[PDB]
Write a protein that holds these residues in place. Structure first.
Motif, mmCIF file in Angstrom:
data_model
loop_
_atom_site.group_PDB
_atom_site.id
_atom_site.type_symbol
_atom_site.label_atom_id
_atom_site.label_comp_id
_atom_site.label_asym_id
_atom_site.label_seq_id
_atom_site.Cartn_x
_atom_site.Cartn_y
_atom_site.Cartn_z
ATOM 1 N N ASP A 3 0.918 -0.808 0.421
ATOM 2 C CA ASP A 3 0.136 0.139 0.294
ATOM 3 C C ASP A 3 0.948 1.484 -0.270
ATOM 4 O O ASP A 3 0.791 2.355 -1.067
ATOM 5 N N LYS A 6 3.002 2.356 -3.051
ATOM 6 C CA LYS A 6 2.047 1.896 -4.160
ATOM 7 C C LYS A 6 1.405 3.720 -4.052
ATOM 8 O O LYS A 6 1.716 4.302 -4.994
ATOM 9 N N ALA A 7 1.395 4.012 -2.881
ATOM 10 C CA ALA A 7 0.911 5.596 -2.850
ATOM 11 C C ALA A 7 2.360 6.411 -2.998
ATOM 12 O O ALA A 7 1.635 7.389 -3.859
ATOM 13 N N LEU A 10 2.096 6.392 -6.576
ATOM 14 C CA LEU A 10 0.959 7.719 -6.442
ATOM 15 C C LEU A 10 1.426 9.464 -7.182
ATOM 16 O O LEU A 10 1.675 10.415 -7.578
ATOM 17 N N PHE A 13 3.515 10.294 -9.280
ATOM 18 C CA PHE A 13 2.923 10.232 -10.895
ATOM 19 C C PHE A 13 1.991 11.800 -10.429
ATOM 20 O O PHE A 13 2.463 12.740 -11.353
ATOM 21 N N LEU A 14 1.827 12.312 -9.319
ATOM 22 C CA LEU A 14 0.935 13.226 -9.343
ATOM 23 C C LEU A 14 2.312 14.659 -9.032
ATOM 24 O O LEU A 14 1.732 15.984 -9.460
ATOM 25 N N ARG A 40 -0.762 24.667 -7.934
ATOM 26 C CA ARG A 40 -1.302 23.521 -8.019
ATOM 27 C C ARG A 40 -0.301 22.506 -7.720
ATOM 28 O O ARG A 40 -0.740 21.505 -6.679
ATOM 29 N N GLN A 43 -1.174 22.440 -3.693
ATOM 30 C CA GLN A 43 -2.719 21.506 -3.070
ATOM 31 C C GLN A 43 -1.535 19.999 -3.701
ATOM 32 O O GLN A 43 -1.660 20.296 -2.393
ATOM 33 N N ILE A 47 -1.730 16.812 -0.528
ATOM 34 C CA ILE A 47 -2.116 16.184 -0.525
ATOM 35 C C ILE A 47 -1.472 14.845 -0.502
ATOM 36 O O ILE A 47 -1.644 13.781 0.470
ATOM 37 N N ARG A 50 -1.028 14.858 3.357
ATOM 38 C CA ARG A 50 -2.317 14.375 4.152
ATOM 39 C C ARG A 50 -1.792 12.214 4.238
ATOM 40 O O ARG A 50 -2.235 11.205 4.798
ATOM 41 N N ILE A 51 -1.889 12.231 2.544
ATOM 42 C CA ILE A 51 -1.654 10.489 2.307
ATOM 43 C C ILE A 51 -0.853 9.858 2.548
ATOM 44 O O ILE A 51 -0.813 8.956 3.054
ATOM 45 N N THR A 54 -0.818 9.432 6.572
ATOM 46 C CA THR A 54 -1.904 8.142 7.729
ATOM 47 C C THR A 54 -1.119 6.590 7.470
ATOM 48 O O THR A 54 -1.685 5.859 7.501
ATOM 49 N N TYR A 55 0.503 6.562 7.393
ATOM 50 C CA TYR A 55 0.676 5.542 6.952
ATOM 51 C C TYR A 55 1.785 5.230 8.089
ATOM 52 O O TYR A 55 2.840 4.239 8.147
ATOM 53 N N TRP B 32 -10.635 15.637 4.288
ATOM 54 C CA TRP B 32 -11.561 14.492 3.846
ATOM 55 C C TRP B 32 -12.427 14.347 3.655
ATOM 56 O O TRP B 32 -12.691 12.727 3.918
ATOM 57 N N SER B 96 -4.454 5.119 4.020
ATOM 58 C CA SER B 96 -4.117 3.551 4.364
ATOM 59 C C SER B 96 -5.413 3.191 4.723
ATOM 60 O O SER B 96 -5.518 1.651 5.067
ATOM 61 N N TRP C 59 -6.825 0.964 -6.138
ATOM 62 C CA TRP C 59 -7.350 1.000 -5.368
ATOM 63 C C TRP C 59 -8.703 0.247 -4.578
ATOM 64 O O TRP C 59 -9.289 0.260 -5.341
#
Lengths: 57, 217, 220
Positions: A3, A6-7, A10, A13-14, A40, A43, A47, A50-51, A54-55, B32, B96, C59
């Motif tokens: 996970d 992958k995150a 991503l 990629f952004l 942009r 932002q 993101i 934050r993403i 969470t890990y 979120w 997650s 996902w």
């Protein structure tokens, strides 16, 4: 962990998407995309921030 | 693994009255979070995104907020239309804990009482010439949703052989409509002449019964 | 200008894999989030998964992982139900996130998946007898019973959608037999019960049926 890898892949990629402008010169229109690209990236920054957060906690 | 705790399950309120739907996050969720209204047989509509800002078109009476793990949708001066189910969406797809849904909160708008116009329908020739008979009792435009329908076959009550169906609430007259279906074979249909449908509603003075006699018109 | 349309929702046997499709169209933005959301009969919304468009970033949710496969393409996003079970009966939705802030700005109308060991059955259309047993003096109601059919849906309209005011299409009801049954009705001034002809425009697409039964006040 699958996970998280992958995150991150991503988020990368952004940042790859929506990259530096051209560059192209035009009166006030040159500085116009600065505003656009700053917005942009500012932002994407939050993101990703934050993403990832969470890990961890 | 992220969870949204939507409260309440249902809610009734008059026009002008204010509604408050609460979502209880199982994890972090910054801004979120988003709020949606979903009218029956229709895709949800976004009202509030990033916890507190309204989508375009959406009226001012829609208010969003939240304090870390508690999020609130506040429809202020409720109008007839707002009658619908409401969902909250929390998280980001990128885990997650992924993104998760509220799980609903049905809003019943509250209006004055209204009497059900009761209509009865007998089994058609083509339906008989098959082997089954279906009797229909209709209750057009009435408030509240509470009512009971009794099926009397020559003044003898019926139960298991019945089935009911109700529409959703009107978006401009906050009314309802029920459909009772009494179903039995062509055999049991020949055995009796006068079929009756008994209706018990709040707006009804006396329990109004509408009926028909087999063949007699 | 943006839009989404889903297709592929059909009655399937259990274990027999189905593939759903979402027609993404009008999005100025290159890559974005495209989510799959299901909603079983009279239940809540459940997020199934999502995909970031420009990549191959799949996902899924806790339950969905394994039995589901999201596939992004040029034109466009798909959802494969690898091993469906009865618990998968629902209407699936595709929803876009034009902002990348985890919120579904644009939705698709849905597509109904039906997972059952039962075979498809067409409807039987009987009228609902008005005349004198439905007279309020200035208003009268006539209907259209749509007994015995499978699977969902059925789309009744009145006088080819020209008759709107007072039309009440009722929700479908499963019978102890297994077959669904519904009944659309309409309120008309008792005066024009002969002057104007009334036709219910039934359509059971999952059986090809396109019945157009006319309801008239008995015989006597």
């Amino acid at each position: 962990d699958e996970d998280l890898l992958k995150a991150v892949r991503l988020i990368k990629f952004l940042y790859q998407s929506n990259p530096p402008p051209n560059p192209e010169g035009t009166r006030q229109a040159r500085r116009n995309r600065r505003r656009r690209w700053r917005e942009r990236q500012r932002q994407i920054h939050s993101i990703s921030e934050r993403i990832l957060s969470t890990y961890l906690g | 693994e992220l969870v949204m705790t939507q409260t309440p399950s249902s809610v009734s309120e008059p026009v002008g009255g204010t509604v408050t739907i609460k979502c209880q996050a199982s994890q972090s969720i910054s801004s979120w979070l988003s709020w949606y209204q979903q009218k029956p047989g229709q895709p949800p509509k976004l009202l509030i995104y990033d916890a507190s800002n309204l989508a375009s078109g959406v009226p001012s009476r829609f208010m969003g907020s939240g304090s870390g793990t508690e999020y609130t949708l506040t429809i202020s001066g409720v109008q007839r239309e707002d009658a619908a189910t409401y969902y909250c969406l929390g998280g980001y797809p990128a885990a997650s804990y992924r993104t998760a849904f509220g799980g609903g909160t049905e809003l019943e708008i509250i209006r004055t009482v209204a009497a059900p116009s009761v209509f009865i329908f007998p089994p058609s020739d083509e339906q008989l010439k098959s082997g089954t008979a279906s009797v229909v009792c209709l209750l057009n435009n009435f408030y509240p949703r509470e009512a009971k329908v009794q099926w009397k076959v020559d003044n003898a009550l019926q139960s298991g052989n019945s089935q009911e169906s109700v529409t959703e609430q009107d978006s401009k007259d906050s009314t309802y409509s029920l459909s009772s279906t009494l179903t039995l074979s062509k055999a049991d249909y020949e055995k009796h002449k006068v079929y009756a449908c008994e209706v018990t509603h709040q707006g009804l003075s006396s329990p109004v019964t509408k009926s028909f006699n087999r063949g007699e018109c | 200008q943006e839009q989404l349309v889903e297709s592929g929702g059909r009655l399937v046997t259990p274990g027999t894999a189905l593939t759903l499709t979402c027609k993404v169209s009008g999005f100025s933005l290159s890559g974005f989030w495209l989510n799959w959301v299901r909603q079983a009969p009279g239940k809540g919304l459940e997020w199934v998964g999502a995909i970031y468009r420009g990549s191959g970033s799949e996902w899924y949710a806790s339950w969905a992982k394994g039995r589901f496969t999201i596939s992004d393409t040029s034109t466009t996003v798909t959802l494969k139900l690898t091993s469906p079970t009865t618990e998968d009966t629902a209407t699936y939705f595709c929803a876009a996130d034009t902002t990348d802030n985890g919120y579904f700005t644009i939705w698709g109308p849905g597509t109904l998946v039906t997972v059952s060991s039962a075979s498809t059955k067409g409807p039987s259309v009987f009228p609902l007898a008005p005349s004198a047993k439905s007279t309020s003096g200035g208003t009268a109601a006539l209907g259209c019973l749509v007994k015995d059919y499978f699977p969902e849906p059925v789309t009744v309209s009145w006088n080819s959608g020209a008759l709107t005011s007072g039309v009440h299409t009722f929700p479908a009801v499963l019978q102890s037999s297994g077959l669904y049954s519904l009944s659309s009705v309409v309120t008309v001034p008792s005066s024009s019960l002969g002057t104007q002809t009334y036709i219910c425009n039934v359509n059971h697409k999952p059986s090809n049926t396109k019945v157009d039964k006319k309801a008239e006040p008995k015989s006597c």
